[PDB]
Amino acid sequence: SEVQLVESGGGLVQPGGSLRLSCAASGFYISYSSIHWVRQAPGKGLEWVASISPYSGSTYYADSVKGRFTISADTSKNTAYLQMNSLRAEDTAVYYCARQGYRRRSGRGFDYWGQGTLVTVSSASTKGPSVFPLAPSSKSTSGGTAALGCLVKDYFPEPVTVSWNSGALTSGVHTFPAVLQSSGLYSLSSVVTVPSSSLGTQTYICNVNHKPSNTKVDKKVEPKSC
Amino acid sequence: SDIQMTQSPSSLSASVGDRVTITCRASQSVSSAVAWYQQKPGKAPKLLIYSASSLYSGVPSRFSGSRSGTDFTLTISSLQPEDFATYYCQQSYSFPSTFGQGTKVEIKRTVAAPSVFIFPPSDEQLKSGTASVVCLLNNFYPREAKVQWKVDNALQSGNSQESVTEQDSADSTYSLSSTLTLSKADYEKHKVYACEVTHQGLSSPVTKSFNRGEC
RNA sequence: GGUAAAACAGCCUGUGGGUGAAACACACCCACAGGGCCCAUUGGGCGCUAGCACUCUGGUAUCACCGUACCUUUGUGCGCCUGUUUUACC
């Protein structure tokens, strides 16, 4: 849509380290709005982090981050920031920037939001995933529909994206929540259901992205014969 | 002292077409400076209501907000399948800003038995050294489901893990994956691998299986 | 914004309400409380003044009385300065 907030800066960081998140604005000028950061620990609720007011530059902070975090606003780049120092395990969360809308149009509601970026505070090291196919068969066929998938194993940290046929194939798709293994690595699988008659003609490819380890894998999933 | 927004219920289930009420209770006056948000799995919150009772532009009129002193209510006049989400109230009266703990709204629908599919480990995985057997339970309701792994008719314990999708925004169903993890040396000590599923939509439990080396 | 013509307000200090792309800060508007200075003091005045007109209260010089001129003070209208708003044209 018209107004967008595009964030960056996330990733793995050592405990006691630092990260700067960016919030790039489009379709409006951050100088006329208040800009907020809100986080969401995985599985948990929204937690407001900080805000910066227009025309005064006044800044405000949740007590859990006061003195460690610094919000700022570079109007000449139309970009806001969050500088995060002395990060603790409990700072792991998805971080959102949000525009407080115009007073006369949406009160103090947060009318636009970034798509979020994940900060993992961990002393563990980054490892790319292994992508294995989940082939369709007569043992994944039922009533003209067949299931095939990709098994995305042994990676850290979250997240991974999985699309299918470069995003040409969307319906019937299930990408499951990652599961944390006893090794401390994550794995998940993405499955898709397709017309069984298409298993001969149509190529199915799962695309797996794991930015923390620069990994970007395309893996063709072809039928086996059970 | 920071203002608390006490939100209730923590979750609810409602059938499609039901009127849904969510309540938020401020620990001190917040005037009308209250917003409601809808957050869908994987996605940023979206604004529904501002100034406690004003409908954000673009938001369907089946959503509405009301205020009575420090009690704030979000209402869905007729719940739709796409209204599956977690809903949050927020106070913007004083700093620091505060959100309620959220309310996860679930859709109640008719029973749907899962379709059950099994996936033998790939050749590519085996020569790296391990073996994952995947059991897929697809598009079932309700979420409760039993997955039993039998290896040559011997039950497994602590040898598998399950993951469940969020409720589907269109048909209100669930899908689940159970994956049996086994070393290659162990995987080749047995022949039959069976996923056994119990679910309320199934008049009797459904078993899918395969023999090793013959997939 | 430019031009032209108006309106409303303007001693100080706080406070509150609002509006300005606006939670605070800032700017402006609108109220309230308290205070200061001037006066002819149960009350009235105060954006600023070396000026102007008139008036009024006290003086000072002429001076028998009367009358005249200047000062001062009460106001009114100017002159001078600021803020906001409105209209017409460009």
Author numbering:
A (entry chain H): 3 to 228
B (entry chain L): 1 to 215
What does the study report here?
The extreme 5′-end of the enterovirus RNA genome contains a conserved cloverleaf-like domain that recruits 3CD and PCBP proteins required for initiating genome replication. The remaining 90 nts at the extreme 5′-end of an enteroviral genome are essential for replication and have been proposed to adopt a cloverleaf-like RNA secondary structure (5′CL) that serves as a platform to integrate viral and cellular protein factors required for initiating the viral genome replication. The proposed RNA secondary structure consists of four highly organized subdomains designated sA, sB, sC, and sD. The subdomain sB with a C-rich sequence in its loop recruits the host poly(C)-binding protein (PCBP) to facilitate the circularization of the viral genome through interactions with poly(A)-binding protein (PABP) complexed with the 3′-end poly(A) tail.
Here, we use a synthetic antibody fragment (Fab) as a chaperone to crystallize and determine the 1.9 Å resolution crystal structure of the full-length 5′CL from CVB3. The crystal structure of the 90-nucleotide 5′CL2a construct assumes a compact, H-type antiparallel four-way junction architecture composed of one stem and three stem-loop regions. The four helical stems composing the four-way junction designated P1, P2, P3, and P4 assemble into two sets of coaxially stacked helices, where P1 stacks on P4 and P2 stacks on P3. Within the four-way junction, with no unpaired nucleotides and perfect cross-strand stacking of the P1 helix G10 with P4 helix G47 and P2 helix C11 with P3 helix C46, each set of these coaxial stacking forms almost a continuous A-form helix. Besides these contacts between sC and sD subdomains, interestingly, our crystal structure revealed that the L3 loop A40 docks into the minor groove of the Py-Py helix through the A-minor type interactions. The A40 contacts with the C56 and U73 through Watson-Crick–Sugar-Edge and Hoogsteen–Sugar-Edge hydrogen bonding interactions, forming an A40•C56•U73 base-triple. Our CVB3 5′CL2a structure solved at 1.9 Å resolution contains a G66C mutation. While the L4 loop, 5′-auCACCgu-3′, within the sD subdomain of our crystal structure adopts a GNRA (N = any nucleotide; R = A or G) type tetraloop fold, previous NMR studies with CVB3 sD subdomain and an enteroviral consensus have shown that WT sD loop, 5′-auCACGgu-3′, adopts a UNCG (N = any nucleotide) type tetraloop fold.
